[PDB]
Amino acid sequence: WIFHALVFSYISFALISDKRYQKKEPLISSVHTKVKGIAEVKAEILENGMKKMVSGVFDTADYTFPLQGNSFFVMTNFIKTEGQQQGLCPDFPTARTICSSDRGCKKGRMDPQSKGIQTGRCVVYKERLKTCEVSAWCPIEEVKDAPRPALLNSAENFTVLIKNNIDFPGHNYTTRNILPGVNITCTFHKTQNPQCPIFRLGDIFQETGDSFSDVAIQGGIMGIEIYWDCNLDGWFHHCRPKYSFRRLDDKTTSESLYPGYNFRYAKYYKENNVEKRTLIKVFGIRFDILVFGTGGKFNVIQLAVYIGSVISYFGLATVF
Amino acid sequence: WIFHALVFSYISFALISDKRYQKKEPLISSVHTKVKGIAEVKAEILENGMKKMVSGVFDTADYTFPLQGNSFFVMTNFIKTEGQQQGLCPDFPTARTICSSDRGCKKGRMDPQSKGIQTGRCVVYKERLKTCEVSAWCPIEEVKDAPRPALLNSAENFTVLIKNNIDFPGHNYTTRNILPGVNITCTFHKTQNPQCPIFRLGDIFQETGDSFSDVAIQGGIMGIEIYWDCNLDGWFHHCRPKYSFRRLDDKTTSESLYPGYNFRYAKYYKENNVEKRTLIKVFGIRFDILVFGTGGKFNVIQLAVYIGSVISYFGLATVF
Amino acid sequence: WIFHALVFSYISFALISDKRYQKKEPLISSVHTKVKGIAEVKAEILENGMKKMVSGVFDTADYTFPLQGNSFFVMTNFIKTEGQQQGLCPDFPTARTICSSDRGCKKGRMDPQSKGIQTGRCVVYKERLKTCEVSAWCPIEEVKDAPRPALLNSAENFTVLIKNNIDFPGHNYTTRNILPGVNITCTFHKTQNPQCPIFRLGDIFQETGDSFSDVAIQGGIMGIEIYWDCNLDGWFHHCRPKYSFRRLDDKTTSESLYPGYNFRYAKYYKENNVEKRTLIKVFGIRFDILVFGTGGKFNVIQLAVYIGSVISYFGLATVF
Ligand SMILES: Cc1nc(/N=N/c2ccc(S(=O)(=O)O)cc2S(=O)(=O)O)c(COP(=O)(O)O)c(C=O)c1O
Ligand SMILES: Cc1nc(/N=N/c2ccc(S(=O)(=O)O)cc2S(=O)(=O)O)c(COP(=O)(O)O)c(C=O)c1O
Ligand SMILES: Cc1nc(/N=N/c2ccc(S(=O)(=O)O)cc2S(=O)(=O)O)c(COP(=O)(O)O)c(C=O)c1O
Ligand SMILES: *[C@@H]1O[C@H](CO)[C@@H](O)[C@H](O)[C@H]1NC(C)=O
Ligand SMILES: *[C@@H]1O[C@H](CO)[C@@H](O)[C@H](O)[C@H]1NC(C)=O
Ligand SMILES: *[C@@H]1O[C@H](CO)[C@@H](O)[C@H](O)[C@H]1NC(C)=O
Ligand SMILES: *[C@@H]1O[C@H](CO)[C@@H](O)[C@H](O)[C@H]1NC(C)=O
Ligand SMILES: *[C@@H]1O[C@H](CO)[C@@H](O)[C@H](O)[C@H]1NC(C)=O
Ligand SMILES: *[C@@H]1O[C@H](CO)[C@@H](O)[C@H](O)[C@H]1NC(C)=O
């Protein structure tokens, strides 16, 4: 007779735990993101072998781009090349582009570590460096590593504000991330104020256990995930989010693979009645907002189905 | 003996309504958007205490940007600052940057309502207004409210074409939003033609009940939902969408929070061998295409499971 | 007594195949995309009835834009109009814009194939063709078909690298598309190596049976699906992706509809203290990364529910 109560207790435990009498609806969301703060750059680099001091300020129209869906990118490090005009000129001398005669590199080929098509004229580049000229935007941007001190090293002091509006299409529920009547001056913390939406780059990077400098030398991918477990029944009703953060990049730095996150941005202009462009190689962290969750509500068909299943189970148990 | 038929009737009702004999699969969709129409601007603004006239025309290359996934932005209002050179210059005098001596604002402190780093030497700015100069782009963008008449109030007179292509990966089904051989010169209405994809901005703004000449001042977020409910079984086969619109913005107008939807655009150029740039503070309505739906197909395993469940239920009912 | 074993065999088959004893969790993903390769353009065009030669080379900062979520765009063909000043000038003479008197077209009427607002002055434009001038950017970009040979016809030779990081928030599982210690230099193939993420545009276009040149005239929408079927149980544990491709565009080429994928890009500048802009109509294939999948783990409550259901089923079968 002990098993008769045991199966009843187990069914009650299952029903209380998994909420099998609850119909679950998916999430439909919309994310708004605002990045504040300004940065100050002051350092020196070696452009083409010549020392050059780069100093100035960056406001919220420089280190960012208009949001693409639910994500946002932040400038961290950049390599600048200016005064590029289209024409024939020798490339940066590497192992694969070096030559001693026109026989080595032939016209029409396209190496995967070079831009343009070479013509097969192995001429001296600089200080008796024989490379064959390529058709591209002169001067070709010499491939160099990112500076050891991060240019946008103050990016850990920036602030971000995230507004989330989730919907449940099965039911008549749409809710927001910010309840009306709460303070706006705050800083997120796992213990002090979980509900605080304002994050800080230093804090989110420290939570994952990675230092900002190493992750920012070449950039990476970061992810803020928001879990929405909401009970829409009349009793014990709550719809509140939980925030966590994870590194979305493999963090391997393989030579064959492509470490971090980077791209090239080209700005065009016309001067002296000829077109020209400036190229910035950009390494920065891209933050992805991953919002997910479920919404539960009371339904009778699923409850009846589960009741029938557990009735069959306990009847079979009572049979033997 | 009435219950012995009541249970069967309720089981049949549940099977017919909830479609428990139908395996369900989620949605994989794709959105293609094209916005047309032109806008004419003719108004007067007050910049730096001087009255200026802004007149001209914007076409589809102006008031929008290339689509970012399933979303599109429309320019509605802008504040322009032209001719910024980078250096030390006084900022806009607020209630926190004023001074009576250099000691009011320290050197190196980063204020949350100022772009640049003040140096700690506060001098007059205009009409004997003492502020401490910051190292930023000059002249500093004048903090002012958006003009009371919308510079692009004709934005409500626009048309947008949306093509949706959804898939059901579990089954073999990929369908579109528009069928072949139908008219393409129409206007969406809830009763006249639900299948019309061309959405007039005035129509979508009036369906929700919010006047266009109010949210256009600071922008906003709107969500267009294309709900799909397709029965992929051979019998009673139909797969058609239903369009709905909602306001995805809080619309609380909180001073502490950031109402509307605004961002800063920066355009760089070079004049007299000096790198300058132009700022445009942009307010506009960002439209989101929220697409969701579940595809249903007849399956034997779920039918058998539900049959067993109702067998248990009505057997228990017959027992007592 | 044969049915007694038959129902048990059917239940076992259903459990083994449909994996009803397995709890399924949805997918939370992130996509990183890198596009390599360079293009060379050398052709002749007819602008304003005059022959011109377009020659140059485009690198990875020209034929693309920064990634917008899980998608990326590639330039394929462009029509350029340089040096536009904003003022009153005649438009392109078409059927709906031609006139013989000022009364044919009235001021303030916005036709739906036009950029600008006419003032009602039917003046000569070229070869004694009378049209009423509109207020817009001049010269107005003449409407013409794209050149028959694609300008970026070499775009089919480009390579794209895709990195996928999928998550299962229900469980403790976050995995990646590329495993560590695997060769990077490779080309994707269904039989040779289906795990290589490096996709070739020519290869993917040929896989779907559509020639690259034909769809490159007006562009299109491409869809790459990554399907994940991962079993998280300790036994028979495997979680690897499968790659599929299809065309996301209707490919109807209806005159009323809008064939292909295209958009207008405007680049602003200042010359002689006058603001001018350059317009580029762009046709190109937009690639979408549709990633989806499910994660299966071992759970006891679903197993018990299905066990009870089959208990009722075979008990009813044995009853009659
Ligand atoms: C040292 C270094 N190396 C870079 N790339 N190295 C590649 C890239 C591709 C291939 S492969 O032929 O496809 O296998 C092989 C190599 S390898 O030299 O490491 O062997 C880049 C990125 O430059 P790009 O954006 O122009 O690609 C940067 C940027 O800063 C860099 O500092
Ligand atoms: C009146 C007005 N006010 C604005 N912002 N007001 C803020 C912003 C932040 C903070 S806080 O310190 O973070 O708490 C407090 C305030 S408060 O003055 O309302 O108290 C902006 C936006 O300007 P930004 O884009 O530069 O932020 C505009 C734009 O038009 C505006 O017209
Ligand atoms: C031949 C041709 N035709 C184009 N458009 N044709 C339209 C567009 C709209 C309407 S409708 O009034 O809305 O029904 C009717 C027509 S129709 O002439 O085919 O009947 C475009 C695109 O030009 P836009 O981007 O300026 O729209 C291009 C671009 O190359 C083109 O080559
Ligand atoms: C961030 O700001 C605080 C404010 O006092 C300052 O102490 C700290 O040095 C700053 N960190 C960086 C990296 O600039
Ligand atoms: C907000 O913070 C201030 C000081 O930081 C405090 O005085 C106030 O009680 C808080 N709550 C509200 C609702 O203002
Ligand atoms: C929109 O266009 C119609 C077309 O005639 C016109 O009557 C109406 O006044 C316009 N409204 C606005 C706000 O431009
Ligand atoms: C489309 O609309 C036109 C007039 O707007 C009408 O004459 C025609 O019958 C409609 N249907 C088709 C298939 O053209
Ligand atoms: C693609 O590159 C290969 C490399 O040899 C070349 O043979 C082929 O002609 C190229 N195709 C196009 C369309 O440029
Ligand atoms: C990778 O490819 C190279 C040649 O393409 C081959 O020699 C090597 O064995 C492969 N595997 C590894 C792990 O390098």
Author numbering:
A (entry chain C), B (entry chain B), C (entry chain A): 31 to 350
Sentences from the paper on this structure:
The structures of pdP2X7 in the presence of PPNDS and PPADS were determined at 3.3 Å and 3.6 Å, respectively. In the PPNDS-bound and PPADS-bound structures, PPNDS and PPADS molecules bind to essentially the same orthosteric site, consistent with both PPNDS and PPADS being pyridoxal phosphate derivatives. It should be noted that while the pyridoxal phosphate groups in PPNDS and PPADS are shared, the naphthylazo group of PPNDS is significantly bulkier than the azophenyl group of PPADS. In both structures, the pyridoxal phosphate group has extensive interactions with the receptor. The phosphate group of PPNDS and PPADS interacts directly with the side chain of Arg294 and possibly also with Lys145, possibly via a water molecule. Furthermore, in the PPADS-bound structure, Lys64 mediates an additional interaction with the phosphate group. Interestingly, despite the structural differences between PPNDS and PPADS, the two common sulfonic acid groups form hydrogen bonds with the side chains of the same residues in the receptor, Lys66 and Gln143. In contrast, both PPNDS and PPADS possess only one phosphate group, so there was no corresponding downward movement in the left flipper domain. The binding of these competitive inhibitors may prevent the downward movement of the left flipper domain, which is required for channel opening. Consistent with antagonist binding, the TM domain adapts to the closed conformation of the channel, as similarly observed in the previously reported closed state structures of P2X7 receptors.
